[PDB]
Write a protein that binds this ligand. Sequence first.
Ligand SMILES: [K+]
Ligand SMILES: [Mg+2]
Ligand SMILES: [Zn+2]
Ligand SMILES: [Zn+2]
Lengths: 203, 204
Amino acid sequence: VGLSYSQTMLLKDLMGGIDPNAPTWIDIEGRFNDPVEIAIFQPQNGQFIHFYREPVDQKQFKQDSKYSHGMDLADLFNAQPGLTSSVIGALPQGMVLSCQGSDDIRKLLDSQNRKDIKLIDVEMTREASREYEDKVWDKYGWLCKMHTGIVRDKKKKEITPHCALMDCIIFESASKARLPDLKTVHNILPHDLIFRGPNVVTL
Amino acid sequence: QVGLSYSQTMLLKDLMGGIDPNAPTWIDIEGRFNDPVEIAIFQPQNGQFIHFYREPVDQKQFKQDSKYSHGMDLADLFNAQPGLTSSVIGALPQGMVLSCQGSDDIRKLLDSQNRKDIKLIDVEMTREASREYEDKVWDKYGWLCKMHTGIVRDKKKKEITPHCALMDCIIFESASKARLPDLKTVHNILPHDLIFRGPNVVTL
Ligand SMILES: [K+]
Ligand SMILES: [Mg+2]
Ligand SMILES: [Zn+2]
Ligand SMILES: [Zn+2]
């Protein structure tokens, strides 16, 4: 099951709040073929798209949880199915998205037949992200409270979890070399659309 | 596989513009409200209509229907676009007034889609006078649906003309006006792109 007709109508309208030409960050958690958290962020206006997805492969999700995003499988079951394909399907034509690790984002977009969406790959030096990582989580951490489980670096060293949304803001900071301060930052997607509503008959 | 893609839904929205919300409109179906296999929404004044198909969950009961009413081939329904029934109904104009022969199943069908706003006019009829135009309709407008290949018989094993959702809309329209419609133009707003499933796509 995916988005109902009405939910798709809603999404269509909300996506109008996206500037087709504005510089836009995109980041995902989970593999390209089985994402669990998607973030699309426009720093110029502070508008972003942040939502979740239930992973097919749960074994790989726990590994990625222990090694990367530290997300709980319990929080993702209530996620609205099909949302990932609808959002990417709803993106403006020929949009240029900035990202880190374009390889997987390219596959994700290609799987959705969005070969029109070009990608600017922007890689962050460890020290550049090291500097802004803490600062972004403090200011904007209230936006995502899904990364509760502890994450571990090599040698069993605890580190800060990776959030699709925080990643975007951190990437924006480090590439622009300054913490971006936008008075208003908000998710265009309502809670009603990010998470499952009541089960409905589909014919 | 799952249902309509985003682009499809965007297309359906535009094509539904062809439907006049305030025009008299017929609706009929084949299969039960909980497991329909043919849907027809018909506007006689302009010949604009919505005609599409669906694959049944219950194949066994579908064969009983194929024997006794609509005579549709299960092979022809495999290639039908899934989720289309829910999409078309969700795309119908608000508070639209529909007419039908036996509003029972239609109510439950529309109710199961939270479309209680849509009103149903139960055009009850003789089922004899309501079918005097049956032969005449299939004659003039039989080319509108060739999904009914199977032989249909009554409980007495005597052959009868198959029941078609689209053709029924036209038959009931005939009986409701005491004359066969002279539809100069006809138009199924749904293209073949939406009626049938396209190439498989990764859906996340
Ligand atoms: K047709
Ligand atoms: Mg009928
Ligand atoms: Zn997050
Ligand atoms: Zn038919």
